[PDB]
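Students often ask why we bother predicting the structure of a whole assembly rather than each chain alone. The short answer is interfaces. A chain on its own may look different once its partners are present, and contacts between molecules only exist in the joint model. In this exercise we take two input lines together and write out one structure for the complete complex. Read the inputs first and try to guess which parts will touch.
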Amino acid sequence: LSLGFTKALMDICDQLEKNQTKMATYLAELLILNYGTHVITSVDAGAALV
Amino acid sequence: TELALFSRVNGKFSTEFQRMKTLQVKDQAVTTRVQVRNRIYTVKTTPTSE
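Now the answer. The structure tokens for the assembled complex follow.
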């Protein structure tokens, strides 16, 4: 995992550890906004024309 | 018209009318629309920025 993704996950873990589920969910939604829903494991480099 | 009386009194009367008319109408309407749109990159801020 990248540095930033790990850092965001650690922040969510710490917020959960502080027994504060309110900003935990906010931080998780921020994670979703910044990194989206899925992670791309395979692409196809190429080109197309119509 | 030709009128001869008594084989002595001659008369002729030739009348000609001639009309010529010409009309020409020529319309041209040329419309041209070119529309190019290039999108090269999509630049985004890193989620870990300050």
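Check your guess against this: The CA atoms of residues 1 and 17 of chain B lie 15 Å apart.
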